[PDB]
């Protein structure tokens, strides 16, 4: 098969994996204002539910949640997930 594969034929940004090139969103985050990932002390168990497997724990679990049933991603797919129409304008 003398075709396909080995994509890219221009080459660009072939850094060593990452040499301080891929920065944030302009370090505009700083401390996300809330700086919850900075103020936190002793503990830090505060995050948007749903992230890991999450199984038996305190209270048994059931199906019809977010397990199984996935033979085709099908329409409705996420990857970016973002929305801000009340920014750089309404600050208070």
Curated annotation (Swiss-Prot):
Impact upon substituting residue 2 to E: Moderately reduces inward rectifier potassium channel activity. Loss of inward rectifier potassium channel activity. Significantly increases outward single-channel conductance at positive potentials
UniProt note on tissues of expression: Brain.
Annotated phenotype, changing residue 1 to K: Does not affect inward rectifier potassium channel activity. Does not affect apparent calcium affinity
Compartment(s) of residence: Membrane; Cytoplasm, Myofibril, Sarcomere, Z line
Domain of life: Eukaryota
Recorded consequence of changing residue 1 to E: Mostly eliminates inward rectifier potassium channel activity. Loss of inward rectifier potassium channel activity. Significantly increases outward single-channel conductance at positive potentials
Region (Calmodulin-binding): 18-92
Family the entry assigns: Belongs to the potassium channel KCNN family. KCa2.2/KCNN2 subfamily.
Protein purpose: Small conductance calcium-activated potassium channel that mediates the voltage-independent transmembrane transfer of potassium across the cell membrane through a constitutive interaction with calmodulin which binds the intracellular calcium allowing its opening. The current is characterized by a voltage-independent activation, an intracellular calcium concentration increase-dependent activation and a single-channel conductance of about 3 picosiemens.
Domain-level remarks: The calmodulin-binding domain (CaMBD) forms an elongated dimer with a calmodulin molecule bound at each end; each calmodulin wraps around three alpha-helices, two from one CaMBD subunit and one from the other. The coiled-coil domaim mediates heteromeic assembly.
Record text on subunit structure and interactions: Homodimer. Heteromultimer with KCNN1 and KCNN3. The complex is composed of 4 channel subunits each of which binds to a calmodulin subunit which regulates the channel activity through calcium-binding. Interacts (via N-terminal domain) with MPP2.
Full protein name: Small conductance calcium-activated potassium channel protein 2
Source organism per UniProt: Rattus norvegicus (Rat)
Phylogenetic placement of the source organism: Eukaryota, Metazoa, Chordata, Craniata, Vertebrata
